[PDB]
Write a protein that holds these residues in place. Sequence first.
Motif, PDB file in Angstrom:
ATOM      1  N   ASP A  19       5.521  12.939 -33.063  1.00 20.05           N
ATOM      2  CA  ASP A  19       6.901  12.888 -33.526  1.00 20.05           C
ATOM      3  C   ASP A  19       7.132  12.890 -35.036  1.00 20.05           C
ATOM      4  N   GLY A  20       6.118  13.311 -35.792  1.00 21.51           N
ATOM      5  CA  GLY A  20       6.269  13.589 -37.198  1.00 21.51           C
ATOM      6  C   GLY A  20       5.268  12.926 -38.101  1.00 21.51           C
ATOM      7  N   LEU A  21       4.894  13.632 -39.161  1.00 28.99           N
ATOM      8  CA  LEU A  21       3.912  13.103 -40.084  1.00 28.99           C
ATOM      9  C   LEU A  21       4.291  11.716 -40.608  1.00 28.99           C
ATOM     10  N   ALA A  22       5.574  11.471 -40.843  1.00 33.48           N
ATOM     11  CA  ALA A  22       5.961  10.210 -41.441  1.00 33.48           C
ATOM     12  C   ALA A  22       5.674   9.034 -40.514  1.00 33.48           C
ATOM     13  N   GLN A  23       5.453   9.290 -39.231  1.00 37.25           N
ATOM     14  CA  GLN A  23       5.133   8.188 -38.296  1.00 37.25           C
ATOM     15  C   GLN A  23       3.806   7.529 -38.638  1.00 37.25           C
ATOM     16  N   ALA A  43       9.943  19.840 -60.979  1.00 39.56           N
ATOM     17  CA  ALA A  43      10.296  19.975 -59.569  1.00 39.56           C
ATOM     18  C   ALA A  43      11.727  19.564 -59.371  1.00 39.56           C
ATOM     19  N   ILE A  44      12.510  20.393 -58.687  1.00 35.86           N
ATOM     20  CA  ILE A  44      13.911  20.154 -58.503  1.00 35.86           C
ATOM     21  C   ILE A  44      14.429  20.179 -57.071  1.00 35.86           C
ATOM     22  N   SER A  45      13.677  20.750 -56.146  1.00 38.78           N
ATOM     23  CA  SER A  45      14.042  20.712 -54.709  1.00 38.78           C
ATOM     24  C   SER A  45      12.826  20.838 -53.750  1.00 38.78           C
ATOM     25  N   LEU A  46      13.009  20.263 -52.571  1.00 41.36           N
ATOM     26  CA  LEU A  46      12.045  20.349 -51.499  1.00 41.36           C
ATOM     27  C   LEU A  46      12.757  20.723 -50.206  1.00 41.36           C
ATOM     28  N   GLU A  47      12.170  21.651 -49.497  1.00 43.53           N
ATOM     29  CA  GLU A  47      12.651  22.082 -48.215  1.00 43.53           C
ATOM     30  C   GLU A  47      11.516  22.233 -47.228  1.00 43.53           C
ATOM     31  N   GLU A  48      11.773  21.866 -45.971  1.00 44.55           N
ATOM     32  CA  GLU A  48      10.710  21.998 -45.006  1.00 44.55           C
ATOM     33  C   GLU A  48      10.905  23.321 -44.263  1.00 44.55           C
ATOM     34  N   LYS A  49       9.881  24.151 -44.298  1.00 40.99           N
ATOM     35  CA  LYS A  49       9.902  25.410 -43.525  1.00 40.99           C
ATOM     36  C   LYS A  49      11.213  26.170 -43.649  1.00 40.99           C
ATOM     37  N   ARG A 104      14.524  19.681 -36.672  1.00 40.34           N
ATOM     38  CA  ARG A 104      13.284  20.017 -35.965  1.00 40.34           C
ATOM     39  C   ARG A 104      12.810  18.980 -34.920  1.00 40.34           C
ATOM     40  N   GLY A 105      13.457  17.825 -34.842  1.00 45.72           N
ATOM     41  CA  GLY A 105      12.987  16.713 -34.001  1.00 45.72           C
ATOM     42  C   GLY A 105      11.831  15.850 -34.561  1.00 45.72           C
ATOM     43  N   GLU A 106      11.585  15.918 -35.860  1.00 42.53           N
ATOM     44  CA  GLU A 106      10.430  15.198 -36.433  1.00 42.53           C
ATOM     45  C   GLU A 106      10.786  14.231 -37.563  1.00 42.53           C
ATOM     46  N   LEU A 107       9.991  13.188 -37.730  1.00 44.75           N
ATOM     47  CA  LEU A 107      10.113  12.273 -38.897  1.00 44.75           C
ATOM     48  C   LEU A 107       9.239  12.970 -39.980  1.00 44.75           C
ATOM     49  N   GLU A 108       9.919  13.572 -40.938  1.00 48.84           N
ATOM     50  CA  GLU A 108       9.321  14.490 -41.930  1.00 48.84           C
ATOM     51  C   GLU A 108       8.702  13.873 -43.175  1.00 48.84           C
ATOM     52  N   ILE A 109       7.487  14.325 -43.479  1.00 47.37           N
ATOM     53  CA  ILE A 109       6.861  13.922 -44.756  1.00 47.37           C
ATOM     54  C   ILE A 109       7.729  14.498 -45.897  1.00 47.37           C
ATOM     55  N   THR A 110       8.360  15.651 -45.659  1.00 45.30           N
ATOM     56  CA  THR A 110       9.143  16.249 -46.727  1.00 45.30           C
ATOM     57  C   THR A 110      10.334  15.324 -47.057  1.00 45.30           C
ATOM     58  N   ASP A 111      10.891  14.662 -46.049  1.00 42.50           N
ATOM     59  CA  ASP A 111      11.950  13.700 -46.317  1.00 42.50           C
ATOM     60  C   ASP A 111      11.432  12.488 -47.188  1.00 42.50           C
ATOM     61  N   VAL A 112      10.204  12.046 -46.922  1.00 46.15           N
ATOM     62  CA  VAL A 112       9.568  10.970 -47.706  1.00 46.15           C
ATOM     63  C   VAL A 112       9.453  11.426 -49.162  1.00 46.15           C
ATOM     64  N   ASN A 113       8.942  12.631 -49.340  1.00 45.63           N
ATOM     65  CA  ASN A 113       8.759  13.170 -50.664  1.00 45.63           C
ATOM     66  C   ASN A 113      10.061  13.345 -51.416  1.00 45.63           C
ATOM     67  N   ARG A 114      11.113  13.802 -50.763  1.00 46.09           N
ATOM     68  CA  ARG A 114      12.409  13.900 -51.416  1.00 46.09           C
ATOM     69  C   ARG A 114      13.005  12.525 -51.834  1.00 46.09           C
ATOM     70  N   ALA A 115      12.754  11.496 -51.037  1.00 44.88           N
ATOM     71  CA  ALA A 115      13.143  10.151 -51.422  1.00 44.88           C
ATOM     72  C   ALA A 115      12.529   9.783 -52.789  1.00 44.88           C
TER      73      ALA A 115
END
Lengths: 292, 292, 293, 292
Positions: free
Chosen positions: D85-89, D155-161, D193-204
Motif C-alpha cells: 500500500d505504498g513506499l511511505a508505509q 528543485a521546485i516541484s515533484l510529481e509522481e509518474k 493511485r491508491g498508495e501512501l507515496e514517498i513522493t508526498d514525503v519528499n514534497r513535505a
Amino acid sequence: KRKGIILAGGSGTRLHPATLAISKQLLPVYDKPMIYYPLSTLMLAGIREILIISTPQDTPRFQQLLGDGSNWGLDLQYAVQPSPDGLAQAFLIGESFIGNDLSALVLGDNLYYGHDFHELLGSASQRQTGASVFAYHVLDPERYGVVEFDQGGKAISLEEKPLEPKSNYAVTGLYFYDQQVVDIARDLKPSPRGELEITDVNRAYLERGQLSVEIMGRGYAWLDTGTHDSLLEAGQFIATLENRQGLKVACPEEIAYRQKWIDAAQLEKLAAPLAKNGYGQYLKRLLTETVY
Amino acid sequence: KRKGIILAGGSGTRLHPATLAISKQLLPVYDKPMIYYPLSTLMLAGIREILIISTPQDTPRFQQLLGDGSNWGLDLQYAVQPSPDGLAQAFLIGESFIGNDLSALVLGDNLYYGHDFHELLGSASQRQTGASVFAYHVLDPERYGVVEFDQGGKAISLEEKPLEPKSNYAVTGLYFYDQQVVDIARDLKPSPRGELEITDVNRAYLERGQLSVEIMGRGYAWLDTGTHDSLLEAGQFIATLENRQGLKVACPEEIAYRQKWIDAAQLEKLAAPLAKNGYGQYLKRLLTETVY
Amino acid sequence: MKRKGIILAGGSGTRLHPATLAISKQLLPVYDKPMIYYPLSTLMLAGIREILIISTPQDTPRFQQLLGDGSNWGLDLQYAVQPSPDGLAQAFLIGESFIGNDLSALVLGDNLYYGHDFHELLGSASQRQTGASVFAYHVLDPERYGVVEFDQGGKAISLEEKPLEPKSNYAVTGLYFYDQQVVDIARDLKPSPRGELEITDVNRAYLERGQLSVEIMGRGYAWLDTGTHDSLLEAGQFIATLENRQGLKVACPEEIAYRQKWIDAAQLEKLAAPLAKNGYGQYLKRLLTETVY
Amino acid sequence: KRKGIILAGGSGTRLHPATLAISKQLLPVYDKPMIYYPLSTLMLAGIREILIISTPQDTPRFQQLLGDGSNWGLDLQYAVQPSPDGLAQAFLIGESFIGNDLSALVLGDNLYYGHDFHELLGSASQRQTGASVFAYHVLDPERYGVVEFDQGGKAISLEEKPLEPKSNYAVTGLYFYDQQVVDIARDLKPSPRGELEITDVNRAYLERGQLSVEIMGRGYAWLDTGTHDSLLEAGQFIATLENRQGLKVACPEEIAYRQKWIDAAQLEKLAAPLAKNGYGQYLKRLLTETVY
Ligand SMILES: Cc1cn([C@H]2C[C@H](O)[C@@H](COP(=O)(O)OP(=O)(O)O[C@H]3O[C@H](CO)[C@@H](O)[C@H](O)[C@H]3O)O2)c(=O)[nH]c1=O
Ligand SMILES: Cc1cn([C@H]2C[C@H](O)[C@@H](COP(=O)(O)OP(=O)(O)O[C@H]3O[C@H](CO)[C@@H](O)[C@H](O)[C@H]3O)O2)c(=O)[nH]c1=O
Ligand SMILES: Cc1cn([C@H]2C[C@H](O)[C@@H](COP(=O)(O)OP(=O)(O)O[C@H]3O[C@H](CO)[C@@H](O)[C@H](O)[C@H]3O)O2)c(=O)[nH]c1=O
Ligand SMILES: Cc1cn([C@H]2C[C@H](O)[C@@H](COP(=O)(O)OP(=O)(O)O[C@H]3O[C@H](CO)[C@@H](O)[C@H](O)[C@H]3O)O2)c(=O)[nH]c1=O
Ligand SMILES: Cc1cn([C@H]2C[C@H](O)[C@@H](COP(=O)(O)OP(=O)(O)O[C@H]3O[C@H](CO)[C@@H](O)[C@H](O)[C@H]3O)O2)c(=O)[nH]c1=O
Ligand SMILES: Cc1cn([C@H]2C[C@H](O)[C@@H](COP(=O)(O)OP(=O)(O)O[C@H]3O[C@H](CO)[C@@H](O)[C@H](O)[C@H]3O)O2)c(=O)[nH]c1=O
Ligand SMILES: Cc1cn([C@H]2C[C@H](O)[C@@H](COP(=O)(O)OP(=O)(O)O[C@H]3O[C@H](CO)[C@@H](O)[C@H](O)[C@H]3O)O2)c(=O)[nH]c1=O
Ligand SMILES: Cc1cn([C@H]2C[C@H](O)[C@@H](COP(=O)(O)OP(=O)(O)O[C@H]3O[C@H](CO)[C@@H](O)[C@H](O)[C@H]3O)O2)c(=O)[nH]c1=O
C-alpha cells in the motif's frame, strides 16, 4: 537453373553516424560480415550464380571482400543501384543477368536460421511456376509487407507497411520467382512511398493465383539487422549458438565444402591465411571431423 | 599546451573475416564509430589538437569521417603507421606534431566510462613533469601491461604480458607525457616479440622516479574492443546506459558544445543533416535541455 | 499409447551460488517465466499429460505452489522427493510406482530445447513402443556431458560420462525416452566412480542389447542448459530475442495446452484473467482470437 | 548512527509468471540474489542496523537467506507489510525500529553502481538534518517520481509518474531522512493511485526548504529490475563488469571485510561453505590480494 540476387544497398541515414564509415551490410554480425548471412541462404538453396547489387560506394567494397566467388565454388557478379528507388528495381538492374532463368532475391539485412531451413529452401526452389514467399509471425507487422489469410489458411491480400495491418504475418526478405518477374517489374509504377515495391511484384502473382505463401514457423529465427538495437540482438543470437555448438553459422567456405562445390584441398588452402584466428582453425577442423 | 594522439591502427588478422572489410577502429560500438570513444576521451581531457595515426588504408577513411575537426572546435591531423610495430612508434610518427609540447596517447580500441572521468583526466593533464598512467584491476592481467605495487601502494615494476603476472593490475591504453617521451621512444629497441613497447617507455619514467600510476577504481568501466566477444559486450554496455538515461556516450558534438568549443548556432548546423535519425534529434534536444 | 513423463528438478545448484541459496535453479527465471516451464513444455509437446516432478525435499513444496496438480492446464502433475542428488537414474527408482507398467520419458530440469519441428522430433520418439531413444547434439565442450561416439557408418558404438578425452563432439542431451525395461535396469545399477547412478549407464545397457536409438538433433535446434551464471544469462537473452521479434512466447503451458486441446477456450480465458494486468495474461487473451500457424 | 530499511515486498506483477515462483527480490541478478544489491548500498553508506520489509509469504524466506546478519557484522531485523500500500508505509511498519534515529530507505529492486558511490553515500548518510534524495537523467521520466529545477538549479516541484513530465530527472529509490519522516508519513493519505507515496514525503520536506536533491551524474548506473527486459539488462551489465575486472559487485562478505565489520578469520569461515564454486573462491582470494 535458378539465379540469385542479393540486394545490399539502401539508404544509410538511419544508422548514421555509425554507418557513416560503413554501409550496414558490411558491419559484422558477431564474427563475420553481415553479407555472409544472406549469401549463405542462397548457397543453401543450391544457388551458385549470384548477382550482388549495392550502391556506387559499397559495390567496390563487396568486390574487394568477396571477389568473383571462384574460391568458394561460386559465380559472383556485381551491379550498382544508383538510388534506393525500391526492391523491385533488382529485377530491372538484374534483367540481363537473369536471362531466361528462374530466380531468387534475398535482402542484405535479412538473417534466417533454423532446423531444416535447407529443405524449406529446396522445396521453394523446386517449384518452377509462379512465386514463393515466406510468412512469419512478428510483433510489429506494420514495419513490413503484410499477408492476410482466409479462415482456411489461404493467402488473400498483401499490403506494404499498412497502418492497420490485417494480420501479424510479415512477408520476409526472401523471394523465389519464375520467368514472369522481369516483365511484372518493368510495368510497375512507384508507389506513394516513391518506391518500386516488391509487394507489388508479389501481388501481381497473387492476382494470377500463382503466389505460394509458405508459413515460416516460430521455430525458425528471422531477424532484420537494420537498426542498432537489432544488430546487437542478432550478434548475441549468433554468439550464443556458435559458442554452445562449436559450429559457425553462415560460413560460406563450410557450405561450399559440404555441397561439394570445393574439395578438401581447396578448403585447406582457404584455411591457411586465417589459420591464426578461430575462423581458420574452424575450417581446418572441418577437414577431420564428421558433422551430421 | 598538451597535444593528443590516437593510435588507431593495428593488425586485423585476429578479427577476420569481420574486419576483412572494416578495421576494428571503424566498427560501431552500438550506435557510433569506435573512434568516437577515444576521441571523446582526449576531448574530456581538454585536448583540441589531435593526431590520428592509422594504417595507410585507413587514414583517408578516418579523414572522410572526421575531416579537419573544425566543425567540432578541434584541430585534427593525420599520420600513417605502415606496420603495427609497436605503440611507442606513435612518438616517432608524431615527433613533428608534438614539437616541444606535452602529450597524451590513447589507444583506438579502448573505451573508458564513469563518474568524474573528466576530473581524473584533468588531474593527469595538469601534471607537467614526468608521465601519468592508470592501473585497473582485471581478471586476465597476462593479456596486458601489468603494474606491481609494494605494500604501501607504490608502483614498483612493469611487465608486458607476463607469463606469471605479479598483480592483477593492468596499465590501460591512456598515457600522459612530458617532453621526455620522444627521446625515450627514439632510444628504444624492439622487444623479443618484435614491438617498440609502450611498457618500455613507461619503465623509463619509472626508473627515473617520474612515473605516476593512478588507480582507476572498480567504479569505472574500462573495456577494449579487441575481440568479437568484447565488442559485443561493449555494445550492450553502451546500449543499456543510453537507453536508460536518454543520454549518449561519447558524442563529440555534445562534448564540444558543453566545453564551449562550438556555440549553439554551430551545434544546430551539425544536427540538421542528422535530423531524420535519433542522433540528429539528440543534438537538437541538447539545445533546449539543461543536462547536469 | 500413454507415455508417462518425469522432470528431474533437484540438485544443489552449486555452480550458481549464491543466487541458488535463495531458490532451486529450476525455479529461477529464464527471461520471463520459471525455468521449469521449459522442460515441462517439452514433455507436453511430446503428448505427455501425466508428469512426475522430482525435486529436493526443500524445493518440492515450492514447485507444488507454482504448478499445483496441473488440472487447470489439463495435466496430471505429481511430486516426489529425491533425498540426495545421487544420480539421474535414481528417477526410475523414485518413480517406479508412478511409472508402473508404462512407457516413460525423463527430461532434465535445466535443459532448454528450441527449434523448428521439435514437436514432430518429440512425437516420433514418444510414439515408439520399444527400446530407448536419446538425442545427440554437437557441442563445443563435450567433456561436460554424456558423450556418444559413432562408427564410420553413423552407428553409435560407445557412451562415456564426462570423459576427460571425449571420443567425439556429440553430447547426449537431457531428454530420454524409455520402454518398460528401464526400471529393472536402474534397479541393477551401482554408483559410478563419480558417486552417481548414471543415466549414461542406463543408456549403455540399452546399447549393449542393440535397443538404443540415438537420434541426431541438428545444429538448427538450440539446446542450452542453464547450469552456469553465464549460460543462464545467455539463455534468457535467446528467449528474449525470439519473443520480442515474434510477438509469441516460448514454453507457455497454457498455450500448449490450448493448442493440444487439453483445455478449451473458456478454460484459457479463465487462466488469462488473473494474469491480465501483465503482458503474459494479455498474450493468453490474444491467443483466443488470433490464428497462429 | 543511521538506521536502514529495505523495502522488499510488492506483487511483482510486471514479472509474472516468473514471480509467481518467487519474490522479485529473491530472483538473481546475474550471480547473486537481487536483494544483495540494495543491502550493499546501505552497507556502503555505513549502515549496519537494517530492517527488511516484505510480504507475509516472503519475509521468512528473506530470514532464511540472510539470517540475523551477525555473520556479516550486521544487525538484520524483519517485518511484514500485509499489503503493498505504498513506499511511505515503510515508516509506519518501521516506526518502532527507527525510534529517534536518522534513517534511510532503499528500494528492493534498485541497483546503483559507479565511481565514488561510496563517497556519494557517505555525504548523504552523514548529514544530520533534512531529507536527501538523488536525481538521475532518464529517457522515460513518466515511470518515476520526477523533480523539476529552476534556472538556478534549485528543485521546485515533484510529481509522481506524471503523464507530462516537467523534466527528464527521476528521483531514484534511495532516500535519507532525519527525525521528521515518521510524523510526516503518519499524516499522509492515499494518493489517487491508491498508495501512501514517498513522493508526498519528499514534497513535505521540499515545502519546508529541507529537501536536498543531489544530482547523480550520468557517470553512474542506476537501474531497476522491474520489467523482464530490465532485469535481463541489469544482469548483463553486472556480468560485463565482473568478467572484465575479476571483482564482484555487491558481495556483502567483501563489503563487511573492507569496512572492518568482520575480520580475516571471519571471512575465511564464510568462504569455506562456498568454496566449491567461483563465489567462495573469490572470497578466499580477497584474503591475500590487496584491492585498491
Ligand atoms: C529500398 C531499398 C532497400 N535496399 C536494401 C536495404 C536492406 O538491406 C534491404 C531492405 O530494406 P529495408 O529498408 O530494411 O526494409 P524495407 O525496404 O522497409 O522492407 C522490405 O523488406 C522487408 C523485409 O526486410 C519486407 O517485409 C518489405 O515488404 C519490403 O518492402 O534492402 C536496397 O538495396 N535498395 C533499395 O532501393
Ligand atoms: C550445413 C549448414 C547449415 N547452416 C545453417 C542453416 C540452417 O539455418 C541451420 C540448420 O541447417 P539445416 O541443414 O537446415 O538443418 P539441420 O538442423 O542441420 O538438420 C540436418 O541435420 C539433421 C541431423 O543430421 C538431420 O536429421 C536433418 O534431416 C538435416 O536437415 O544451420 C549453416 O550455417 N552452415 C552449414 O554449413
Ligand atoms: C601494436 C599496435 C597496436 N595498435 C592499436 C590497435 C588497438 O587499437 C590498440 C591496442 O593494440 P592491442 O594489440 O589491442 O593491445 P595490446 O597491443 O595487446 O596491448 C597494449 O594495450 C593494452 C591495453 O589496451 C596495454 O595494457 C598493453 O600494455 C599494450 O601493449 O593499438 C596500433 O595502432 N599500432 C600498433 O603498432
Ligand atoms: C569496495 C566495493 C565497492 N563496490 C561498488 C560500489 C560502487 O558502486 C563501486 C565503486 O566503489 P567505490 O568505493 O564507490 O569507488 P571506486 O571507483 O572503487 O573508487 C575508490 O577506489 C579508488 C581507487 O583506489 C580511489 O581513488 C577512490 O577514492 C575510491 O573511492 O563498486 C562493491 O560492489 N563492492 C565493494 O567491495
Ligand atoms: C545428478 C542429479 C541432477 N539433478 C538435476 C539437476 C539439473 O536440472 C539436471 C542435470 O544436472 P547437471 O549436474 O546439469 O547435469 P549433469 O548431471 O552434469 O549431466 C547430466 O546431464 C547432461 C545434460 O544436461 C548429460 O549430458 C549427462 O549425461 C548427464 O549425466 O538434473 C537432479 O535433480 N538430481 C540428481 O541426482
Ligand atoms: C506450438 C508451440 C511451439 N513451441 C515451441 C516448440 C518448438 O521449440 C518451437 C517450434 O514449434 P514446432 O511446432 O516444433 O515447429 P514450428 O516451427 O512452429 O513448425 C510448425 O509450424 C509450421 C508453420 O505452420 C508447420 O509447417 C510445421 O509443420 C509445424 O511443425 O516452438 C512453443 O514454445 N509453444 C507452442 O505453443
Ligand atoms: C508500492 C510498494 C513497493 N514495494 C517494493 C517493490 C519494489 O522493490 C520497490 C519499488 O516498487 P515499484 O512499484 O517498482 O516502484 P514504483 O513504486 O513504480 O516507484 C517508486 O520507485 C521509483 C524508483 O524505482 C521512484 O522513482 C518513484 O518515485 C517511487 O514511487 O518497492 C513494496 O515493498 N511495498 C510497496 O507498497
Ligand atoms: C559530459 C559528458 C560526459 N560523458 C561521459 C564521460 C564520463 O565517462 C561520463 C561521466 O561524465 P563526467 O562529466 O566525468 O562525470 P558525471 O557523472 O557527469 O559527473 C558530473 O556531473 C555531476 C552531476 O552534475 C557532478 O556532481 C560532478 O561533479 C560532475 O563531474 O560520461 C560523455 O560521454 N558525454 C558528455 O557530454
